[PDB]
Design a protein around this ligand. Structure first.
Ligand code: G3H
Ligand code: G3P
Ligand code: G3P
Ligand code: CA
Ligand code: CA
Ligand code: CA
Ligand code: CA
Lengths: 325, 325
């Protein structure tokens, strides 16, 4: 539903047996903030590019594909395992914090055609979306996604749409107040962007619940029973017929793995993950303070353990996207 | 050079016997300024939408198609002649005069898909381009046209690219200084955007010379001879294999008509025109002052006479785009 020959071939290069076990490292401003916590000077371009190349070289042998940004990640893309596919990010990093609109914007000197010419098997785009937000803002966001979806249809390259939800009136998405509305924000946004007019091939989405407030997982206030959390996962599955994959949102590797198990037990038929920080977060401190060689040894030990255990979990929880397309 | 079935059918709906005799009325800010100089109050949306409808309803019976803007011309597009095709402008009007980059920008809540859904047979986009300008600026512009070209391929709708040339250093493009380089600006820009990667189907371009400085046409200072001018047109013909049409550029109708004859004599194989103010400008004064009914009679008399004379010149100067495709 309903891949062209070329789009199918690219999807196969990004997955194994219909499951996407992709490594995500297109973070730019978020990576800079992480490195800023560990050194005096400002993170330089050589540091950004080198660290991306280390993660790509050491960990892509254990992923079906890697997501990188064209601004700092092109060197890293050339050192990935020959068995791993490539996704390239298309959006500018971050958003304007002085306003609530968080309007999307493509990299200035890039296009879907140039992403394909750079060797990518997919275009990835991040959209911030408040389903309950200003209707004129959301009309502009939907028109923008339509353009990108049309680009990808013309270039015949899969369109991976990442949706991060928020509320114009809630400052912290980690708060209990946002947790109470998160399922609504996520599942209704997925329903909108599963419409044919947007040309999405795979949705990259948050889990529809903040697991730190679910019974059995919560260390403090409990907002949801397990059955209530399970129902949010079943609503998410009932919100789209497209393939969708989960992002880690920077939670610990263990919590993300436990969440995937819970998702599968609840009835969610997710088709993999695009997991970033939960895998390689710890390499940042080591690289900045210890250097590149020490970072390699971290990736070969702690990094491998994160992605290896994730792969074991994906093997028993994820469903193949070939059942949907 | 090649067209899909639907792109070819749309091109036929925009032309007559392979000739494009299109009426241009996508003006917005410029039209508002023409109205402001005839009344005290500020022009209203109702006035703008009504005048576009009068022009569309009265003059489209004598044109192969009409170019309108989605912001005020959608009512006018519905009262157009059944035999006239529709083109819709896609770009935001004007440019920021505080800088020299003149970067393109699409209408916020529009896309090629929505333009097609609004009933258009083609997408029209305007690009300001200085072939000698800042290389990074032009790289961003080229990337931008690639996206729009890809959209139009996906939606299977002809892409009409309008190129207006300028110089980052020369303020007035009507000056003698700019006339001595206009041929370089026009012809070289046509070479760039004739490349397959931009997906252009038709170019809306200026004549490669300021005829007001050509021997026999200039009422004062003479910069070029007819032989030098004729060579500029032959260079323009040799700069693209795509169909291309001339824009009136606001010059007098008589001068524009004489330029089409001179172009055909020099060897230019242009495929039509997109003429606007030179055909209907006189109705603005009548409409604002004498009202909508007086403007209608002006269009049925003087307005018809203008477009009728133009069509008679086109029948003796324009070449069919079917000979290039
Ligand atoms: O630039 C600021 C953003 O919050 C960082 O996120 P990003 O690196 O994924 O674009
Ligand atoms: O410049 P005009 O008025 O002839 O119209 C040509 C074009 C403007 O959309
Ligand atoms: C998506 C990045 O583009 C996945 O990032 P993550 O750290 O897992 O949330
Ligand atoms: Ca091999
Ligand atoms: Ca489903
Ligand atoms: Ca299973
Ligand atoms: Ca005619």
């Amino acid at each position: 539903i309903t891949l062209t020959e070329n789009k199918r071939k690219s999807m196969e290069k990004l997955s194994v047996d219909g499951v996407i076990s992709a490594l995500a490292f297109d973070q730019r401003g978020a990576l800079k903030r992480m490195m800023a916590q560990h050194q005096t000077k400002e993170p330089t371009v050589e540091q950004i590019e080198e660290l991306k190349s280390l993660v790509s070289e050491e960990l892509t042998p254990f992923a079906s594909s890697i997501l990188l940004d064209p601004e700092y990640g092109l060197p890293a893309s050339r050192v990935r395992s020959e068995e791993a596919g490539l996704l390239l990010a298309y959006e500018k990093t971050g958003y304007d914090a002085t306003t609530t609109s968080r309007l999307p914007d493509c990299l200035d000197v890039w296009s879907a055609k140039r992403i394909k010419e750079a060797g990518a098997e997919a275009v990835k785009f991040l959209l911030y979306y408040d389903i309950d937000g200003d209707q004129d803002v959301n009309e502009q966001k939907k028109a923008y996604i339509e353009r990108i979806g049309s680009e990808c249809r013309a270039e015949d390259i899969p369109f991976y749409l990442e949706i991060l939800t928020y509320d114009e009136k809630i400052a912290d998405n980690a708060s209990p107040e946002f947790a109470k509305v998160k399922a609504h924000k996520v599942n209704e946004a997925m329903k909108v962007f599963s419409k044919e007019r947007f040309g999405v091939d795979v949705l990259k989405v948050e889990v529809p619940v903040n697991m730190k407030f679910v019974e059995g997982f919560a260390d403090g206030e409990v907002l949801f029973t397990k059955e209530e959390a399970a129902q949010a996962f079943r609503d998410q599955e009932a919100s789209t017929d497209l393939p969708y994959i989960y992002l880690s949102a920077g939670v610990s590797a263990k919590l993300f793995q436990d969440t995937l198990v819970f998702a599968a037990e609840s009835g969610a038929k997710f088709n993999g993950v695009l997991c970033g920080r939960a895998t390689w977060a710890g390499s940042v401190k080591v690289y900045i303070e210890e250097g590149p060689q020490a970072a390699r040894e971290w990736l070969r030990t702690e990094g491998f353990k994160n992605i290896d255990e994730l792969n074991k979990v994906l093997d028993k929880t994820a469903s193949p996207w070939t059942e949907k397309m």
